Design a protein around this ligand. Structure first.
Ligand SMILES: C[C@H](C[C@@H](C[C@H](C[C@@H](C[C@@H](CCN1CCCC1=O)N1CCCC1=O)N1CCCC1=O)N1CCCC1=O)N1CCCC1=O)N1CCCC1=O
Ligand SMILES: COc1cc(CCNC(=O)c2nc(Cc3ccccc3C(F)(F)F)[nH]c(=O)c2O)ccc1O
Ligand SMILES: [Mn+2]
Ligand SMILES: [Mn+2]
Length: 180
């Protein structure tokens, strides 16, 4: 199907990020040409996770998001057997070696409060850190511990708002906001 959203996602995001989002959606049994809003969402989430890992020290983060499910769970099991942190019931996004905790990164189109509430209700181990961003420039982290420096998060919010602006300029932001 000829979707403007698909072409915009391919023009906006990095090709390797697009390939990773495509592989993730195909592994989860979703059509990137049909679920174009979910395609944009997966690309955005991947890019935000990569920018997050880009912040901090060189060996600070172990990246779980992006890998296929089997290898991702393998790295999670290795981290749990190495450090001793409780195994999470759901696949997280990163692991902070400095703070020694799993990080779940979320990107929302609504208020960060509701999104964080749903995520804290989903995750039951509580030991997993949750860091939520929004397309309006807001953020919320567990225990007010935002992990990274202010600049590394500020560039993330800037990129999110740029993506929102481009979506609105292409007249696709309304359906993308209604999709969530
Ligand atoms: C480690 C290796 C690759 C990393 C890739 C990851 C994403 C990176 C994309 C690259 C291109 N860069 C780097 C310069 C800008 C850019 O665009 N960045 C960073 C910015 C946004 C983005 O997209 N990063 C982060 C650190 C440097 C790097 O390259 N990946 C891929 C998924 C898992 C992972 O860790 N691995 C590991 C195994 C598979 C693989 O390929
Ligand atoms: C069983 O469902 C889950 C699967 C996973 C492992 C892989 N998916 C993510 O890692 C992840 N997916 C999403 C959005 C999404 C997209 C597809 C299905 C379900 C969901 C969610 F349910 F999350 F809305 N947003 C994240 O930020 C994000 O990290 C983790 C937690 C889950 O509850
Ligand atoms: Mn994830
Ligand atoms: Mn996430």
């Amino acid at each position: 199907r000829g979707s403007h959203m698909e072409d915009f996602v391919r023009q906006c995001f990095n090709p390797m990020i697009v390939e990773l989002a495509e592989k993730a959606m195909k592994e989860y049994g979703e059509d990137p040409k049909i679920e174009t809003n979910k395609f944009a969402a997966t690309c955005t989430h991947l890019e935000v996770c990569f920018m997050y890992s880009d912040g901090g020290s060189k060996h600070r983060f172990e990246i779980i998001e992006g890998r296929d499910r089997i290898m991702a769970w393998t790295v999670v099991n290795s981290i749990c057997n190495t450090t001793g942190v409780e195994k999470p019931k759901f696949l997280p996004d990163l692991y902070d070696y400095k703070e020694n905790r799993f990080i779940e990164i979320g990107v929302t189109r609504r208020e960060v409060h509701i999104y964080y509430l749903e995520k804290a209700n989903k995750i039951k181990s509580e030991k997993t850190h949750i860091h939520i961003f929004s397309f309006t420039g807001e953020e919320m982290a567990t225990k007010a511990d935002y992990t990274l420096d202010e600049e590394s998060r500020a560039r993330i919010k800037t990129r999110l708002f740029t993506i929102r602006q481009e979506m609105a300029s292409r007249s696709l932001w309304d359906s993308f906001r209604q999709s969530e």
